[PDB]
């Protein structure tokens, strides 16, 4: 598994080199913003259930076919599987966010996922949408939390978004 430092190290090694002063300071900056990062990961963990629930309510509000017989979130067994997948993806997105690298998300979650869903008959476009809704709400929480020191978290909100967007793209 990689994190943002480990990634630097692998690229340096492929040159046969000690880390460039370029790469050093990029990593010094990651340490600089790490308290914000911890709050951002904490924002997701602290509202995981609601993020999934709210995404869910809204997914089925839009796509009332999934909860009809014939639909891929019917009966209870399938809805529980769908709720479970929403949690799994939100979980690996939070891991990537602590790590500063998408690899755990791509390697443990996204790799093969689309082909799984197609084999199953699970409508990937609906799954992509559920991921887009989790993103909206998750970032909502990253941006408006309990008595965190005021500052600018937009860099981290972007990065979190790209992890949500990776997952969506990979699946649709």
């Amino acid at each position: 598994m990689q994190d943002a430092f480990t990634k630097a190290i692998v690229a340096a090694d492929l040159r046969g080199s000690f880390l460039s002063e370029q790469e050093l300071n990029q990593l010094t900056n990651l340490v600089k913003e790490s308290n914000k990062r911890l709050d951002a990961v904490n924002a997701i963990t602290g509202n995981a259930a609601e993020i999934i629930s709210d995404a869910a309510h809204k997914l089925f509000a839009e796509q009332t076919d999934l909860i009809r017989p014939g639909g891929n979130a019917y009966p209870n067994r399938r809805m529980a599987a769908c709720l479970r997948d929403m949690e799994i993806i939100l979980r690996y997105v939070s891991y990537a966010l602590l790590a500063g690298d998408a690899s755990v998300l791509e390697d443990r979650c996204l790799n093969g996922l689309k082909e799984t869903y197609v084999a199953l008959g699970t409508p990937t476009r609906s799954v992509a949408r559920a991921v887009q809704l989790m993103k909206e709400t998750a970032i909502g929480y990253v941006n408006s939390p309990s008595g965190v020191t005021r500052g600018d978290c937009s860099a981290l909100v972007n990065e979190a978004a790209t992890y949500f967007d990776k997952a969506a793209a990979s699946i649709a």
């Binding site: 430092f5 190290i9 090694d13 080199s17 911890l38 979980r91 690996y92 602590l98 790590a99 443990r108």
Partner: protein, 162 residues
């Protein structure tokens, strides 16, 4: 690749679990510690050239016979491959410093070490003595928590070789 960050994530994943306060506290340690680590890294990085030549020589001074003909400290190629090897170790030490864990050392030098050294007739004693010397000189390039970090990883290599 073992870092504090990857370790806590691995432990969460394997229990199917979001990162919680236990895991985020851990991560803060790694981030709080980065300053000392990275100071050690910068000092080891710019002194690399001489740290390597110092340790290479010390291998010959401690094992005089190595530099006689028919031996493995003789001729340009042996002495070249030696400098390179110590340089590999210092390189991974700096990586381990920067990464926040032994991962780079575990994955690129420790995994397989003995099998390789045994097939190629390379004695660990040389490498321990290279590292003991590097440890002596790093005593005056650093101090405080950067020195402790440098030491942690140098010693880690010496234990890997014993």
């Amino acid at each position: 690749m073992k870092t504090v960050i990857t370790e806590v994530i691995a432990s969460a994943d394997s229990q199917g679990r979001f990162l919680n306060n236990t895991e985020l506290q851990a991560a803060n340690g790694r981030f709080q510690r980065a300053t000392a680590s990275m100071e050690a890294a910068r000092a080891l990085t710019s002194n690399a050239d001489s740290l390597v030549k110092g340790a290479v020589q010390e291998v010959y001074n401690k094992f005089p016979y190595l530099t006689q003909p028919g031996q493995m400290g003789y001729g340009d190629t042996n002495q070249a491959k030696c400098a390179r090897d110590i340089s590999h170790y210092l390189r991974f030490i700096t990586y381990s410093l920067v990464a926040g864990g032994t991962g780079p050392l575990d994955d690129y030098i420790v995994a397989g070490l003995r099998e390789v050294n045994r097939t190629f007739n390379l004695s660990p004693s040389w490498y321990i003595e290279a590292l003991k010397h590097i440890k002596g000189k790093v005593g005056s390039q650093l101090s405080g928590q950067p020195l402790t970090e440098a030491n942690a990883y140098i010693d880690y290599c010496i234990n890997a070789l014993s």
